[PDB]
Coordinates of C-alpha atoms and ligand atoms in Angstrom, one line a residue:
Chain A
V1 CA -98.5 52.1 -171.2
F2 CA -95.4 50.4 -170.4
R3 CA -92.9 53.5 -170.0
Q4 CA -89.8 52.7 -172.1
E5 CA -87.8 55.0 -169.9
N6 CA -84.5 53.4 -167.7
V7 CA -86.2 53.0 -164.2
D8 CA -83.2 53.3 -163.0
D9 CA -83.6 57.3 -163.5
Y10 CA -86.3 57.3 -161.3
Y11 CA -85.8 54.9 -158.8
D12 CA -82.9 54.0 -156.4
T13 CA -83.0 50.1 -156.2
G14 CA -82.6 48.3 -152.4
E15 CA -82.2 44.8 -151.4
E16 CA -84.0 41.8 -153.1
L17 CA -87.3 41.0 -151.3
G18 CA -88.0 37.9 -153.1
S19 CA -86.9 35.3 -156.0
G20 CA -89.8 34.3 -158.0
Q21 CA -89.8 31.6 -160.8
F22 CA -89.3 34.4 -163.8
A23 CA -89.3 37.2 -161.3
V24 CA -87.0 39.0 -158.8
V25 CA -88.5 41.7 -155.8
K26 CA -86.4 44.6 -154.6
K27 CA -87.2 47.4 -152.6
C28 CA -86.9 50.6 -154.5
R29 CA -87.4 54.1 -153.7
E30 CA -88.6 56.8 -155.7
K31 CA -86.2 59.6 -156.0
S32 CA -88.7 62.9 -156.2
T33 CA -90.8 61.9 -153.3
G34 CA -88.8 59.4 -151.2
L35 CA -91.4 56.8 -151.2
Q36 CA -90.7 53.1 -151.0
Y37 CA -92.2 50.6 -153.1
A38 CA -91.4 47.0 -154.5
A39 CA -90.0 46.6 -158.1
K40 CA -91.0 43.2 -159.5
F41 CA -88.6 42.2 -162.4
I42 CA -90.5 40.1 -164.8
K43 CA -88.9 38.3 -167.6
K44 CA -90.6 37.9 -170.8
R45 CA -90.2 34.8 -172.8
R46 CA -87.5 35.7 -175.3
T47 CA -89.4 34.1 -178.4
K48 CA -92.5 32.9 -179.1
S49 CA -92.1 29.1 -178.6
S50 CA -89.9 29.6 -175.4
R51 CA -91.2 27.7 -172.5
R52 CA -89.3 30.0 -170.3
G53 CA -90.7 33.8 -169.6
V54 CA -93.8 35.0 -169.4
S55 CA -95.3 36.2 -172.7
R56 CA -96.7 39.5 -173.1
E57 CA -100.0 38.4 -173.4
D58 CA -99.8 37.2 -169.7
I59 CA -97.8 40.2 -168.5
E60 CA -100.7 43.0 -170.3
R61 CA -103.3 40.8 -168.6
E62 CA -101.8 40.9 -165.5
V63 CA -100.9 44.7 -165.3
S64 CA -104.1 46.0 -167.0
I65 CA -105.5 44.4 -164.5
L66 CA -103.6 45.9 -161.5
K67 CA -103.4 49.3 -163.3
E68 CA -107.7 49.3 -162.3
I69 CA -107.1 48.4 -159.0
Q70 CA -107.8 50.9 -156.0
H71 CA -108.6 49.5 -152.8
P72 CA -107.3 49.4 -149.1
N73 CA -107.2 45.8 -148.8
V74 CA -105.6 45.1 -152.6
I75 CA -102.3 46.0 -153.3
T76 CA -101.9 48.7 -156.0
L77 CA -99.5 49.5 -158.9
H78 CA -97.5 52.6 -158.9
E79 CA -96.1 52.6 -162.2
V80 CA -94.7 50.1 -165.1
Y81 CA -91.5 49.8 -167.1
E82 CA -90.2 47.9 -169.8
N83 CA -86.6 46.9 -171.2
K84 CA -85.3 44.6 -173.8
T85 CA -85.3 41.7 -171.1
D86 CA -87.9 42.9 -168.5
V87 CA -90.9 44.2 -167.7
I88 CA -90.8 46.1 -164.1
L89 CA -93.8 46.7 -161.8
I90 CA -93.7 49.5 -159.5
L91 CA -95.8 48.1 -156.9
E92 CA -97.3 48.9 -153.5
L93 CA -94.5 47.6 -151.1
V94 CA -96.0 45.4 -148.5
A95 CA -93.7 44.2 -145.9
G96 CA -95.9 42.9 -142.9
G97 CA -95.6 39.1 -144.3
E98 CA -98.7 36.8 -144.4
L99 CA -101.3 36.7 -142.3
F100 CA -101.1 33.5 -141.0
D101 CA -97.7 33.9 -140.0
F102 CA -98.7 36.9 -138.2
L103 CA -101.9 35.2 -136.5
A104 CA -99.3 32.4 -135.2
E105 CA -97.3 34.6 -133.2
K106 CA -100.9 35.2 -131.2
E107 CA -101.5 33.2 -127.7
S108 CA -104.8 32.8 -128.8
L109 CA -107.3 33.8 -131.4
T110 CA -111.4 34.4 -131.2
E111 CA -113.7 34.1 -134.0
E112 CA -114.7 37.7 -133.3
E113 CA -111.0 38.8 -134.0
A114 CA -110.3 36.3 -136.9
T115 CA -113.6 37.8 -138.9
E116 CA -112.2 41.1 -138.0
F117 CA -109.3 39.9 -140.6
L118 CA -111.6 38.1 -142.8
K119 CA -113.8 40.8 -143.6
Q120 CA -110.9 42.5 -144.9
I121 CA -110.9 40.0 -147.2
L122 CA -113.7 39.7 -148.5
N123 CA -114.5 43.5 -148.9
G124 CA -111.2 43.3 -151.4
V125 CA -112.7 40.6 -153.1
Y126 CA -116.1 42.5 -152.9
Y127 CA -114.4 45.1 -154.8
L128 CA -112.5 43.1 -157.3
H129 CA -115.8 41.0 -158.3
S130 CA -117.6 44.4 -158.5
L131 CA -115.1 45.0 -161.3
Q132 CA -115.7 41.5 -162.7
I133 CA -112.1 40.4 -161.7
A134 CA -111.9 36.9 -160.6
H135 CA -108.3 36.7 -158.5
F136 CA -108.1 33.0 -159.2
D137 CA -105.5 32.2 -156.2
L138 CA -106.9 33.2 -153.2
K139 CA -104.6 31.2 -150.5
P140 CA -102.9 32.0 -147.2
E141 CA -99.7 33.1 -149.0
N142 CA -101.4 35.8 -150.8
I143 CA -103.2 37.4 -147.9
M144 CA -100.3 39.8 -146.6
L145 CA -100.4 42.4 -144.1
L146 CA -99.1 46.2 -145.1
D147 CA -97.6 46.6 -141.6
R148 CA -97.6 43.9 -138.5
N149 CA -96.8 46.6 -135.6
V150 CA -99.9 48.7 -135.5
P151 CA -102.8 47.8 -133.3
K152 CA -105.1 47.1 -136.2
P153 CA -103.3 45.4 -138.9
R154 CA -104.6 45.9 -142.5
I155 CA -104.9 43.1 -145.1
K156 CA -103.4 43.4 -148.6
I157 CA -104.4 41.1 -151.2
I158 CA -101.5 40.4 -153.8
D159 CA -100.3 38.2 -156.8
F160 CA -102.7 38.8 -159.7
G161 CA -100.9 36.8 -161.9
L162 CA -103.8 34.2 -162.7
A163 CA -106.5 36.9 -162.4
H164 CA -108.9 37.5 -165.1
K165 CA -112.1 39.8 -165.9
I166 CA -114.9 37.4 -166.2
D167 CA -116.2 38.1 -169.8
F168 CA -117.2 35.0 -172.1
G169 CA -113.7 35.4 -173.7
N170 CA -110.9 33.2 -171.6
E171 CA -110.9 33.1 -168.0
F172 CA -108.6 30.0 -169.0
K173 CA -106.2 27.7 -169.6
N174 CA -102.8 28.6 -167.8
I175 CA -105.5 28.8 -164.5
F176 CA -103.9 26.0 -162.7
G177 CA -103.4 27.2 -159.0
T178 CA -102.6 25.0 -155.7
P179 CA -104.7 21.9 -155.5
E180 CA -105.9 22.3 -151.9
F181 CA -107.6 25.6 -152.6
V182 CA -109.0 25.2 -156.3
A183 CA -113.0 24.8 -157.2
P184 CA -114.3 21.9 -158.4
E185 CA -114.9 23.8 -161.6
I186 CA -111.2 24.4 -162.1
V187 CA -109.7 20.7 -161.3
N188 CA -112.6 19.5 -163.9
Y189 CA -112.2 22.1 -166.7
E190 CA -115.7 23.5 -166.5
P191 CA -116.6 27.0 -166.9
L192 CA -115.2 29.5 -164.6
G193 CA -116.4 32.7 -163.0
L194 CA -116.1 34.6 -160.0
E195 CA -117.5 31.8 -158.0
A196 CA -114.0 30.4 -157.9
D197 CA -112.6 32.7 -155.9
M198 CA -115.7 32.1 -153.0
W199 CA -114.5 28.2 -152.8
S200 CA -110.8 29.7 -152.1
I201 CA -112.4 31.8 -149.5
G202 CA -114.1 28.6 -147.8
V203 CA -110.8 26.8 -147.7
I204 CA -108.9 29.6 -146.1
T205 CA -111.7 29.9 -143.5
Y206 CA -111.8 26.5 -143.1
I207 CA -107.8 26.7 -142.4
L208 CA -108.0 29.8 -140.1
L209 CA -110.1 28.2 -137.6
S210 CA -108.6 24.5 -137.4
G211 CA -105.2 24.3 -138.7
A212 CA -106.5 21.4 -140.9
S213 CA -106.6 21.6 -145.1
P214 CA -110.3 20.3 -145.9
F215 CA -109.2 18.5 -149.0
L216 CA -105.7 17.5 -148.7
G217 CA -104.6 13.8 -149.4
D218 CA -101.3 12.1 -149.3
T219 CA -101.0 12.9 -153.0
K220 CA -101.8 15.4 -155.4
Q221 CA -104.6 12.8 -157.1
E222 CA -106.4 12.5 -153.8
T223 CA -106.1 16.3 -153.1
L224 CA -107.7 16.7 -156.4
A225 CA -110.0 14.0 -156.1
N226 CA -111.9 15.4 -153.0
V227 CA -111.8 18.8 -154.2
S228 CA -113.8 17.2 -157.6
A229 CA -115.9 14.8 -154.8
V230 CA -116.2 17.9 -152.1
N231 CA -115.6 15.1 -149.7
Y232 CA -114.5 17.1 -146.3
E233 CA -115.4 17.0 -142.8
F234 CA -115.1 19.2 -139.8
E235 CA -113.6 16.6 -137.4
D236 CA -113.8 17.2 -133.8
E237 CA -110.1 17.3 -133.4
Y238 CA -109.7 20.5 -135.1
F239 CA -113.2 21.8 -134.7
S240 CA -114.8 21.1 -131.0
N241 CA -114.6 25.0 -130.0
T242 CA -115.8 26.0 -134.0
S243 CA -119.3 27.9 -133.7
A244 CA -122.3 26.6 -135.5
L245 CA -121.9 29.7 -137.4
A246 CA -118.8 29.5 -138.3
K247 CA -119.3 25.8 -139.8
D248 CA -122.4 27.0 -142.0
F249 CA -120.2 29.9 -143.3
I250 CA -117.8 27.4 -144.3
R251 CA -120.3 24.7 -145.3
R252 CA -121.9 27.3 -147.9
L253 CA -118.7 28.0 -149.8
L254 CA -117.9 24.7 -150.2
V255 CA -120.3 24.0 -152.7
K256 CA -119.6 21.9 -156.0
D257 CA -122.2 23.8 -158.1
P258 CA -121.0 27.3 -158.6
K259 CA -124.7 28.8 -158.9
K260 CA -125.6 27.2 -155.4
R261 CA -122.4 28.9 -153.7
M262 CA -122.6 31.9 -151.6
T263 CA -121.4 35.0 -153.7
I264 CA -119.6 37.7 -151.9
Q265 CA -122.8 39.7 -151.2
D266 CA -123.9 36.9 -149.6
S267 CA -120.6 35.9 -147.6
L268 CA -120.6 39.7 -146.3
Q269 CA -124.4 39.8 -144.9
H270 CA -123.8 36.1 -143.4
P271 CA -124.6 36.2 -139.6
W272 CA -121.3 34.9 -138.6
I273 CA -119.7 38.1 -140.3
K274 CA -122.8 40.1 -139.5
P275 CA -124.6 38.9 -136.4
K276 CA -128.3 40.2 -136.2
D277 CA -128.6 40.1 -132.5
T278 CA -126.1 39.5 -129.4
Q279 CA -126.7 35.9 -129.2
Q280 CA -124.7 35.3 -132.7
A281 CA -122.5 38.2 -131.3
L282 CA -121.6 37.1 -127.8
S283 CA -121.0 33.2 -129.6
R284 CA -118.3 34.7 -131.8
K285 CA -116.9 36.2 -128.7
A286 CA -116.7 33.0 -126.9
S287 CA -115.6 31.1 -129.7
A288 CA -111.8 30.4 -130.0
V289 CA -109.4 29.1 -132.8
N290 CA -107.5 25.6 -132.5
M291 CA -104.2 27.8 -131.8
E292 CA -101.6 24.5 -131.1
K293 CA -102.8 23.0 -134.4
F294 CA -102.9 26.3 -136.4
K295 CA -99.1 27.3 -135.6
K296 CA -98.3 23.4 -136.3
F297 CA -100.3 23.8 -139.6
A298 CA -98.1 27.1 -140.4
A299 CA -94.8 26.0 -139.7
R300 CA -95.5 22.5 -141.1
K301 CA -96.7 24.2 -144.1
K302 CA -93.1 26.1 -144.6
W303 CA -91.0 23.3 -143.7
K304 CA -93.1 21.3 -146.6
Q305 CA -92.3 24.4 -149.0
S306 CA -88.8 24.3 -148.0
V307 CA -88.5 20.3 -148.5
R308 CA -90.4 20.1 -151.8
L309 CA -87.8 22.6 -152.7
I310 CA -85.1 20.6 -151.8
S311 CA -86.4 17.5 -153.4
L312 CA -87.0 19.2 -156.4
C313 CA -83.3 20.5 -156.6
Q314 CA -82.2 17.2 -155.7
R315 CA -84.1 15.0 -158.4
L316 CA -82.6 17.3 -161.1
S317 CA -79.2 17.3 -159.4
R318 CA -79.3 13.4 -160.1
Chain B
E1 CA -97.8 19.9 -169.3
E2 CA -97.7 19.8 -165.6
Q3 CA -94.2 18.7 -165.1
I4 CA -93.0 21.4 -167.5
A5 CA -94.4 24.0 -164.5
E6 CA -91.7 21.9 -162.3
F7 CA -88.7 21.7 -165.0
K8 CA -89.3 25.5 -165.4
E9 CA -88.9 26.9 -161.6
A10 CA -86.0 24.5 -161.2
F11 CA -84.2 25.6 -163.7
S12 CA -84.5 29.3 -162.6
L13 CA -82.7 28.6 -159.4
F14 CA -80.2 26.5 -161.2
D15 CA -79.6 29.7 -163.5
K16 CA -79.0 31.8 -160.5
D17 CA -77.9 35.2 -163.2
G18 CA -81.2 34.5 -165.1
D19 CA -79.6 34.9 -168.6
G20 CA -80.9 32.1 -169.8
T21 CA -78.1 29.3 -169.5
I22 CA -76.8 27.1 -166.9
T23 CA -73.0 27.5 -166.4
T24 CA -71.0 25.0 -164.3
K25 CA -70.1 27.9 -162.0
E26 CA -73.6 28.2 -161.6
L27 CA -74.3 24.4 -161.3
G28 CA -71.6 23.9 -158.4
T29 CA -73.1 26.6 -156.3
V30 CA -76.1 25.1 -156.8
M31 CA -74.8 21.8 -155.4
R32 CA -73.0 23.8 -152.5
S33 CA -76.3 24.7 -151.1
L34 CA -77.7 21.3 -151.7
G35 CA -75.0 20.1 -149.1
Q36 CA -72.6 18.5 -151.6
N37 CA -69.0 19.3 -152.4
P38 CA -67.7 18.4 -155.8
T39 CA -65.0 19.3 -157.8
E40 CA -64.6 21.4 -161.0
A41 CA -63.5 18.1 -162.8
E42 CA -67.1 16.6 -161.9
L43 CA -69.0 19.8 -162.4
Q44 CA -68.0 19.6 -166.0
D45 CA -68.7 16.3 -167.0
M46 CA -72.5 16.6 -166.1
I47 CA -72.6 19.8 -167.9
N48 CA -70.7 17.9 -171.0
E49 CA -73.4 15.2 -171.5
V50 CA -76.8 18.0 -171.2
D51 CA -74.9 20.0 -173.5
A52 CA -76.3 19.0 -176.3
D53 CA -75.1 21.5 -178.8
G54 CA -71.1 21.5 -177.5
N55 CA -71.3 25.4 -176.3
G56 CA -70.3 24.9 -172.7
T57 CA -73.6 25.7 -170.9
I58 CA -77.0 24.2 -170.2
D59 CA -80.4 26.2 -172.3
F60 CA -83.9 25.1 -171.3
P61 CA -84.2 23.1 -174.3
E62 CA -81.6 20.9 -173.0
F63 CA -82.4 21.0 -169.6
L64 CA -85.8 20.0 -170.3
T65 CA -84.6 16.8 -172.4
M66 CA -82.9 15.8 -169.4
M67 CA -85.9 13.9 -167.6
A68 CA -85.5 10.7 -166.5
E69 CA -91.2 9.7 -147.6
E70 CA -87.8 9.2 -148.6
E71 CA -87.7 13.0 -149.7
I72 CA -87.5 13.9 -146.4
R73 CA -84.6 11.9 -144.7
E74 CA -82.7 13.4 -148.0
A75 CA -84.1 16.8 -146.9
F76 CA -83.1 16.7 -143.3
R77 CA -79.5 16.0 -144.8
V78 CA -79.5 19.6 -146.2
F79 CA -80.9 21.7 -143.6
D80 CA -78.4 20.0 -141.2
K81 CA -75.5 21.7 -143.0
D82 CA -72.9 20.9 -140.4
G83 CA -73.7 17.4 -140.2
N84 CA -73.7 17.3 -136.2
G85 CA -77.6 16.0 -136.1
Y86 CA -79.2 19.2 -135.6
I87 CA -80.9 22.0 -137.4
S88 CA -80.3 25.6 -135.8
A89 CA -81.7 28.4 -136.9
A90 CA -78.6 30.0 -138.3
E91 CA -78.7 26.6 -140.7
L92 CA -82.3 26.7 -141.8
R93 CA -82.1 30.4 -142.7
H94 CA -78.7 30.3 -144.6
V95 CA -79.3 27.1 -146.5
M96 CA -83.1 28.5 -147.8
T97 CA -81.5 31.9 -148.3
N98 CA -78.8 30.0 -150.8
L99 CA -81.9 28.0 -152.3
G100 CA -83.9 31.1 -152.9
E101 CA -86.7 31.6 -150.2
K102 CA -86.1 34.7 -148.1
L103 CA -87.5 33.3 -144.7
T104 CA -88.3 36.4 -142.0
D105 CA -86.7 35.7 -138.7
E106 CA -90.3 35.3 -137.6
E107 CA -90.8 32.3 -140.2
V108 CA -87.4 30.9 -139.2
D109 CA -88.5 31.2 -135.4
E110 CA -91.9 29.4 -136.0
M111 CA -90.6 26.2 -138.1
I112 CA -88.0 25.6 -135.3
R113 CA -90.3 26.1 -132.4
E114 CA -92.9 24.2 -134.1
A115 CA -90.6 21.3 -134.8
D116 CA -88.8 21.7 -131.5
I117 CA -90.3 18.8 -128.9
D118 CA -87.1 18.8 -126.5
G119 CA -86.5 22.7 -126.1
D120 CA -83.1 23.0 -126.9
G121 CA -83.8 25.2 -129.9
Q122 CA -82.7 23.0 -132.6
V123 CA -84.4 20.3 -134.7
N124 CA -83.3 16.8 -134.8
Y125 CA -84.0 13.9 -137.4
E126 CA -86.9 12.6 -135.3
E127 CA -88.4 16.0 -134.8
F128 CA -87.9 16.9 -138.3
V129 CA -89.8 13.5 -138.8
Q130 CA -92.7 14.5 -136.2
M131 CA -92.9 17.8 -137.9
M132 CA -93.4 16.2 -141.9
Ligands
LIG1 CA1 -77.0 31.7 -166.0
LIG2 CA1 -75.8 24.2 -174.4
LIG3 CA1 -76.5 21.7 -137.4
LIG4 CA1 -84.8 20.0 -130.2

């Protein structure tokens, strides 16, 4: 259950690692073991009609999913506490930052190297899908590294606030994520399943290799319209060194019809991920990411977010 | 609504302590960090006509009933905290921490490096424009 004892009895609480919409994350240390975690304090809605805070229904769903998860590429939940105002999640400390930020420090990145990270994401999603769990918010900021200063950094998928067990009953309603990454079925209010995560993966992979966002338009409407129409391209500007294999991987994920979209199992057998011969293998090693545009994209994304924040504060400040 | 989503996130950073109400002390430091420098008498008035009930603070219902690229010009003015025409690493980091967002040294350095055309380690207006 949610433990009703005082978390401060069991944890030292440290510096603030994050400042979410109705949440704060602090580093914490379990006193008995000395082991470090992240404590995320989720504010509960104070009454049923209040639009502020998180409903208990939503918190239980998230926790119920998190308690089940045990995989090296997905964040794990250690304990949960609850007081009058907050539900406190004691989570695995994931401190290596975003994958894209790590990659953006590199001189160069081959498709080979990129798939080594990609593979880990696909294994984490295959694990979730095997448990009938849909993430529903797969995007680069939710793909983190445990520790960025090892020779082979480990991916952790995070942020299960939109995730559902896929069952006849509701995968739905507070399902609205980021336009650039959501599948057509989400944008069009159609049945959802595990397939929405597979679309998200194609969009991530697309940006991984190119430093462009497939369905982004000048506005939120164009963006959503381009998703609904599956209107994208491989532009020569961004994709002149991208292998045929990689393009086909993306192509089979960016598919409107969720039933024709590659499953997570298909994606792991696909020869861009699992070459059948040296030909396919060497091609992956010969073929390198557009790193100038990729760095421009990671950086612009962060500047775009900061502006968007300021502009929001600004609109209201008037 | 979709707008609810936006008004909910704003309320959070205005409500620094998260007790559910915006004080004028909180509204002032929010506006310090937006590059402004107003006085308590100004701050109090702003609170005083959003304050529907009249209890000296703004709650969400009240915040929510107050409802009604350019955002880049104005956004530059916020980053350049000291008005000298250039955003430094220090300004970027300091200004965004004060807006809730904790950037790593690595994020900061990527941001400046990718925007910095002439290589002086700072971002001027045009450079900002080319980035955005
Ligand atoms: Ca407050
Ligand atoms: Ca009030
Ligand atoms: Ca300056
Ligand atoms: Ca410069």
